[PDB]
Design a protein around this ligand. Structure first.
Ligand SMILES: NC[C@H](N)c1ccc2c(c1)OCCO2
Lengths: 300, 237
């Protein structure tokens, strides 16, 4: 189990770690998060009490370095930093633990939720979507635009998701216009899986990462990407059977975790009704259809 | 965006544009089968592609053989229309290619957009005008060429005959839409109006009769009366 210490907490803030969250009062003696499960990526995220504008946060993997949080009063945010002095780091963590100044990652033994949401998410793929090569961790916030959003404005601060556009020459073979527009299997299997992602695990990793950024930051372009990647599969008549089964599991856990009161802003009614009730795969998403109907029957 | 009564003079500016109407592409008669079921029989159709400024009509005849062994024909018809319009554009010299294509039915937007991805600078637009181009097959010489076709064929017409030597495009389009609306509403009575007087004929190289300027005024009035008469019959007014 690993630890992200905090130098201090000078401003009142809601801190998230993965799907958990807790409130820290201004100048309260908070010095970090311990017992973080090794083996998964994680995200530590922030929403200031005095200015809920900008949710922001950091994706990281404790196997790749020793990371900590320190507030910067000039830029006005909690920043992740890497500590290269390993013996300094262990000494700081040990002291804070001895004084019980850290919260414990509150995972229930029975609970696979975080694994289920991040099964295909790897730090290396995150770092290609979020480009800041000098850090081993990746910053995301609520306002960051996607590359495709910037084509339709600072490129260094963009989310480089794979562009999906159903009315593009990439999606549509000359001479197969009707075929390729009504059945997206070419675009899914040849262009995206074989050509760009190389395999379905990388496709699902980006889909899962887009969902989590939508949910944790309210990032609108991430929500667009998540829905586009679902629609591309559902609108394809020919999809490897293992992919359909795994997509159903992925979406089930996403819908299960979504905060009920955020459903109006995180779910696209058109996409979900098309995917569940009209698409080629309308009968291939049994678990997802069941939770959607029991949890969000209004959307449908 | 869409095209309506606010920007109606835009049709007659100097940017090349084409209307595309697909309502006569897939034409069927429905009839009873020997077992008491119902079956369709297709007949030849056409794509109606019109330049409203010049009157040039590119009439692509859709021969029934294009439907043989195909499914979901009403859907296929839209994609076949888009394929043929795209082919037409590619056949035109660059300086003759349209800057806008206006479809009469919004269901044509995505098929045409997808077929025209190679032409990102040609705008594909709907219209809020209700245009009576479905009545094109009430023009005898157009109906004749379509029904006689034994293979796919493109035939070029000027739907204004020689009117543009005496009137503006705006006025020619208004005359055309009034004629077509009257033929759509009551084809028999409209044709009676157009041919009642044996001394006025249709030139071999024309679609409509050779009316003088004063006779066109009379004809147009009789067409308006027909439309109003039929509106009164329909709604009991
Ligand atoms: N080619 C110019 C255009 N078709 C036009 C406009 C007005 C006219 C006219 C011709 O004939 C003379 C009287 O009114």
């Amino acid at each position: 189990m690993n630890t992200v210490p905090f130098t201090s907490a000078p401003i009142e803030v809601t801190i998230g770690i993965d799907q958990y969250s807790f409130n820290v009062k201004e100048n309260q003696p908070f010095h970090g998060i311990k017992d973080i499960p090794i083996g998964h990526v994680h995200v530590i995220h922030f929403q200031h009490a005095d200015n809920s504008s900008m949710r922001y946060g950091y994706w990281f993997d404790c196997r790749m370095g020793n990371f900590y949080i320190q507030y910067d009063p000039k830029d006005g945010l909690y920043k992740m930093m890497e500590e290269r002095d390993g013996a300094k780091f262990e000494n700081i963590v040990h002291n804070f633990k001895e004084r019980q100044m850290m919260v414990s990652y509150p995972k229930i033994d029975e609970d696979d939720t975080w694994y289920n949401l991040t099964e295909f998410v790897q730090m290396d793929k995150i770092r290609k979507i979020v480009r800041k090569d000098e850090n081993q961790f990746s910053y995301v916030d609520s306002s960051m635009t996607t590359v495709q959003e910037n084509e339709l404005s600072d490129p260094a601060h963009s989310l480089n998701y794979t562009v999906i556009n159903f009315k593009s020459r990439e999606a549509i073979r000359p001479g197969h216009e009707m075929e390729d527009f009504l059945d997206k299997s070419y675009y899914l299997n040849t262009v995206m899986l074989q050509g760009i992602f190389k395999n379905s695990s990388n496709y699902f990793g980006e889909l899962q990462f887009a969902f989590l950024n939508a949910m944790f930051f309210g990032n609108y372009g991430s929500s667009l990407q998540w829905h586009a990647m679902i629609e591309l599969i559902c609108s394809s008549a020919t999809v490897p059977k293992h992919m359909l089964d795994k997509l159903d599991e992925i979406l089930y856990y996403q819908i299960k975790t979504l905060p009920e009161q955020y459903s109006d802003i995180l779910l696209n009614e058109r996409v979900w009704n098309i995917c569940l009730y009209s698409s080629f795969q309308k009968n291939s998403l049994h678990n997802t259809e069941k939770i959607m109907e029991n949890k969000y029957p209004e959307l449908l | 965006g869409a095209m309506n009564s606010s920007n109606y003079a835009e049709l007659f500016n100097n940017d090349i544009k084409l209307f595309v109407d697909d309502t006569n592409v897939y034409r069927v008669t429905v009839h009873k089968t020997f077992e008491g079921n119902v079956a369709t029989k297709a007949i030849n159709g056409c794509i109606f592609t019109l330049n409203p400024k010049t009157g040039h009509l590119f009439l692509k005849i859709i021969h029934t053989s294009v439907w043989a062994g195909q499914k979901r024909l009403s859907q296929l018809a839209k994609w076949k229309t888009a394929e043929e319009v795209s082919a037409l554009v590619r056949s035109l010299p660059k300086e003759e290619q349209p800057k806008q294509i206006i479809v009469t039915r919004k269901a044509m937007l995505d098929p045409l957009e997808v077929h025209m991805l190679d032409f990102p600078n040609i705008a594909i637009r709907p219209t809020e005008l209700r245009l009576p181009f479905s009545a094109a097959m009430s023009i005898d010489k157009l109906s004749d060429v379509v029904m006689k076709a034994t293979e796919p064929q493109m035939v070029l017409f000027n739907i204004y005959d020689d009117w543009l030597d005496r009137i503006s495009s705006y006025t020619a389009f208004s005359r055309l839409t009034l004629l077509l609306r009257a033929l759509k509403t009551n084809e028999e009575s409209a044709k009676m109006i157009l041919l009642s007087d044996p001394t006025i004929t249709i030139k071999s190289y024309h679609l409509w009769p050779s009316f003088t300027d004063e006779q066109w005024i009379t004809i147009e009035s009789q067409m308006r009366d027909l439309i109003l008469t039929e509106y009164g019959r329909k709604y009991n007014v």
